Amino acid sequence: SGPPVSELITKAVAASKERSGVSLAALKKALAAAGYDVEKNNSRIKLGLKSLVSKGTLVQTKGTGASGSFKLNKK
Amino acid sequence: KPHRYRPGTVALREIRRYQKSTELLIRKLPFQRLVREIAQDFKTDLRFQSSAVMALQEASEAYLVGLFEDTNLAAIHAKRVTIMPKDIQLARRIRGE
Amino acid sequence: KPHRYRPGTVALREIRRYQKSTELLIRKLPFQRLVREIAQDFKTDLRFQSSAVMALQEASEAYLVGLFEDTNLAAIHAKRVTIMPKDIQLARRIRGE
Amino acid sequence: ARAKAKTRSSRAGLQFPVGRVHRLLRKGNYSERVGAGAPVYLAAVLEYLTAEILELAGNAARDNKKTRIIPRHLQLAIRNDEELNKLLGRVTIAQGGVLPNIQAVLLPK
Amino acid sequence: ARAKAKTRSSRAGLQFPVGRVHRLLRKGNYSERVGAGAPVYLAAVLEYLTAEILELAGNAARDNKKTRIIPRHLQLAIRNDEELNKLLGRVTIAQGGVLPNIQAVLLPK
Amino acid sequence: KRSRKESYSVYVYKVLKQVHPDTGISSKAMGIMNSFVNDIFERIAGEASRLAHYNKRSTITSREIQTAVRLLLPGELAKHAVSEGTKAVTKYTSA
Amino acid sequence: KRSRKESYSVYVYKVLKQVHPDTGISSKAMGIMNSFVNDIFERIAGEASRLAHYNKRSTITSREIQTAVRLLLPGELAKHAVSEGTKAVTKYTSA
Amino acid sequence: KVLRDNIQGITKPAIRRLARRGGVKRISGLIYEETRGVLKVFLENVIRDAVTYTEHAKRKTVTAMDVVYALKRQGRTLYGFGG
Amino acid sequence: KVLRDNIQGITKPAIRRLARRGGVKRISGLIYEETRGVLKVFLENVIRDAVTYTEHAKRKTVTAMDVVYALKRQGRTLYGFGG
DNA sequence: GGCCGCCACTGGCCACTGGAGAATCCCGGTGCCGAGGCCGCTCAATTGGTCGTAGACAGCTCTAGCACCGCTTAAACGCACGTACGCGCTGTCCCCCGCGTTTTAACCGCCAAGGGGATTACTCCCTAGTCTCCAGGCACGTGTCACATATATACATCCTGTGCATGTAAGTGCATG
DNA sequence: CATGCACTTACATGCACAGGATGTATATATGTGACACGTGCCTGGAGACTAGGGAGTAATCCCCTTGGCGGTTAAAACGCGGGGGACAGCGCGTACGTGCGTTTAAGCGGTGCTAGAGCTGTCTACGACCAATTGAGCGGCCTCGGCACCGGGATTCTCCAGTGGCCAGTGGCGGCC
């Protein structure tokens, strides 16, 4: 079981802290390295990242929706 | 609730049907009209054997169909399932036309 | 730093050169060796006019070069600049090879 | 004092007319002289080819449980042989239809 | 005692050999008789085609400042004419090269 | 009545009964086989004429017919056509 | 001792000097022209032969050649060739 | 006497039928007029030759045998109408 | 005498040269062997034809006339070799 | 006492599945019209001989290819470092087939009419063929200048450092809480 | 005193421009062989003349093609809609591009040989030509049974509604600080 994928996405984006936001591909590779069945849960990842965007805790840099780059808010 | 098939299912059944079929798909007399219309552009008031019209219909449908398999190959080669006129232009340019 | 062209610039210059040039793009002696290699498989002790081998040459680059413009048309159709062997396969099959 | 007029197709054990094909070659203007065995060889080659295409046609008609051969069966036979299709790729049969062929990407999941 | 020799090419007023083309058509086995005007007409057609393609090759050579016709000049002359290209879409030329031609997407920016 | 028009109905019917005594034939398919045999015949005649011209041969004989059928027919079709024609040539040679 | 071989050299060179008196030629380009003029010669000749067969005529006339030109040569070259060949035939008729 | 618009007689559903015979699953809306133009080109290319044959045959009636001659001229030989 | 893999005698940079004459910008690494097989098929077909001409000619040596006859048999006519 | 982390309750979402509906395949049945078999005709395959020649071989020749060898760089290979390009993913918007309805003209099918395809006859224009004679084009030899090659400038153009237009964020003086 | 804010000011990013470097053009010098041009010849093409025969032309007729008229419905067209697909954006990892160093092997000159292409004489096998003849194959007829169309049931496919599992949102409580 464990925690839901939202917290895992938060450590996935917080692992790098590049100038550009993390891609969908890079966070998928990060969840693959940390361990997740990403092949079964692409829609789960998309809804989790979009939900985190809607809270304003994450801000999308260049892409729209689930594409492009994703970086943390100001605080 | 009135049934509605999901898109392309009827199209695939059409593909199976008309691959199974052998008959001409063109309306015969409009084809004759167009053949005579092109004919008078070369020589007016000519007569036609109906066999000549049927032969032109067969050859025309065959050339068109082979063009469409080439177009289908180009479209799937472009990783698409919808054919485009640019696909046809590509196919004709490959064929040397 | 030393001089270094960006990718494609040398490719453009050599494209302009070889389109401008007419000279053979195959080393002649291994080509002749391959011709004798293939021909021995069909009949033994075959001898060649050098002119015959040369005509076999310009036929070879003719067929190959035309195949690559077909491939390039497929690639620009496929929104790419890098050709892949399935593009050549598409060109052959649409030509009917 | 003539002997019985025997036929050259029977002399070669063949079905196709040796005399008619020889006449066609003499009047088709391919050379002014024709070697005697050449139309025999040609008729044998044609008989062989017709034998295989008719055999495949009868096989296809039997596959479609049909007792009388069909131009559809001719198309299905001529296209499903690799060497025959390579022989006759540019040639179309009237009312032949097409091969049943759907690309895998066209097929649904 | 005999009329002086006068060529049939001059009788047409043409340069291409009427007698040579006549002999080639007779020995080329296309019909057992041939009309008198047919080889004259044929030689006239070939002379016209040769003259026009030689004009085009001359323009191609003059554009590249060369006095003599080159197979590159022939390739450029034929491939840049859509009429002659459709005449010769399946014809290859020794040491001819191709048209200088690039796709626009292959160009930078 | 009218003038006689040449056809290949009887020979193809005999060959059909050689390969399939049981089955029938449609007349439009018969026209197809006539077109087929005429097309192949004129092809082979053309390359025979060309090859006889290349060797400057006034007489068309069986050897370049063999050459032409090996040239056009792909692979095992060509080899078995050579075999059948060679057999028939030997039998007619033996009258 | 050598056997004489046929070429189109004198005719192509003279028509070149007619169309361009100042223009030379390379010899392998002349070989290409030899192949071209020969190739079109058998194209028109084969068309004339089969057209003579189709109307069952054993004599190929200028009408057959002109028909073959309209077949193989497309568009403007066909009609220009027809006009010049008609002029040549008319001049031969006066000859 | 004259004819002005019969190229539109090759209707869109007929082209759809041909495409389903061609194995095309999905057809754009821009296809049909371009196929009409392509068909027009092919038909005029064969029928100009057919008119040439028929006039060279001194006939005013178009025969199918000339259509066979024209089609086999352009490398598109058809079986089922020879003779 | 006996030759083994002269198909690789067509070097990869020669294939790049042929592609640049065709105006090809970028070439995959998978291309060269596949094109070697394709040209192998092409050469074996035309040399089968040219050979068949040659033993019919009762000659041991291939002539260029046989080659150009083979190419015009395939609708790939080449000019400039005495045809 | 408050706040956060963890455990539990709960609703939403995704896939699995069964069943209904519809298109299709399969099964006789039956009238009907091409298939095929018979029959009468005719023309062309045969049969036989002859004459003239087409090509196969003997022999001979010279020539082009085949191999060897020996230098001699050009490029092929190979490695390395970097960008840019296939390509994978997703968001989004719109395009086109499914389906139902309306119209419409295509098609059967029927009938009139006449036109030219085709067939037969007739007579003749041409042309294939033969012999004579002769000049045209090709082999042969030669010479000579258009072009190949080399080399030195001259510009084009492409990459790159960098100089200016624009976004950003922080420091701090000042007004005021 | 303190503190936040706003204004000012330094920092950073991207676009634009000058400048170098190298590749390509381009201008001048030099040989050379390839193209072009005079020459002998013989051989292929023109000249004269004929036979006859394929082809042009007249006549006809009938069959095929065109023209037209009514019914009916399949066929096309039109509209709604709603899902699936095209496609743009974005990024990423990699796989060729480019560049530099090496090996080698491609290439050129020169030697030598002989299979082998190819020419020439013979002459003989073979095939075209020609007269009779017939029987095989083609035109026409007629019957039938295979099969196209029709009608009925089973089957299969599909699509969507019902259902359970899976996951995340939410609440509540204990424990520690």
mmCIF file of C-alpha atoms (C1' of nucleotides) in Angstrom, chain A residues 4-5 19 23 25 29 40 44 47 51 62-63 67-69, chain K residues 12-14 88-93 165-170:
data_model
loop_
_atom_site.group_PDB
_atom_site.id
_atom_site.type_symbol
_atom_site.label_atom_id
_atom_site.label_comp_id
_atom_site.label_asym_id
_atom_site.label_seq_id
_atom_site.Cartn_x
_atom_site.Cartn_y
_atom_site.Cartn_z
ATOM 1 C CA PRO A 4 -0.619 7.822 -2.355
ATOM 2 C CA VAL A 5 1.322 8.885 -5.428
ATOM 3 C CA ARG A 19 16.399 25.643 -13.217
ATOM 4 C CA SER A 23 9.425 16.682 -17.219
ATOM 5 C CA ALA A 25 9.424 11.621 -18.546
ATOM 6 C CA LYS A 29 11.988 7.664 -14.556
ATOM 7 C CA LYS A 40 -0.368 0.722 -14.966
ATOM 8 C CA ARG A 44 -3.119 8.195 -11.859
ATOM 9 C CA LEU A 47 -4.574 13.231 -12.177
ATOM 10 C CA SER A 51 -4.609 17.991 -8.628
ATOM 11 C CA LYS A 62 6.341 25.721 -19.899
ATOM 12 C CA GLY A 63 3.923 22.934 -20.827
ATOM 13 C CA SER A 67 2.984 18.056 -20.657
ATOM 14 C CA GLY A 68 6.156 20.088 -20.294
ATOM 15 C CA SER A 69 7.953 21.053 -17.114
ATOM 16 C "C1'" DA K 12 20.494 37.988 -15.553
ATOM 17 C "C1'" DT K 13 18.383 36.644 -20.149
ATOM 18 C "C1'" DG K 14 17.702 36.881 -24.748
ATOM 19 C "C1'" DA K 88 1.131 21.293 -31.451
ATOM 20 C "C1'" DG K 89 4.072 21.758 -27.296
ATOM 21 C "C1'" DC K 90 7.661 20.051 -24.646
ATOM 22 C "C1'" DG K 91 11.312 17.577 -23.328
ATOM 23 C "C1'" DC K 92 15.036 13.898 -23.411
ATOM 24 C "C1'" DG K 93 18.116 10.844 -24.346
ATOM 25 C "C1'" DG K 165 -11.547 -3.799 -6.828
ATOM 26 C "C1'" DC K 166 -8.222 0.124 -6.319
ATOM 27 C "C1'" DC K 167 -6.906 4.329 -5.058
ATOM 28 C "C1'" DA K 168 -7.090 8.969 -2.995
ATOM 29 C "C1'" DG K 169 -9.729 12.424 -0.288
ATOM 30 C "C1'" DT K 170 -11.222 13.006 4.299
#
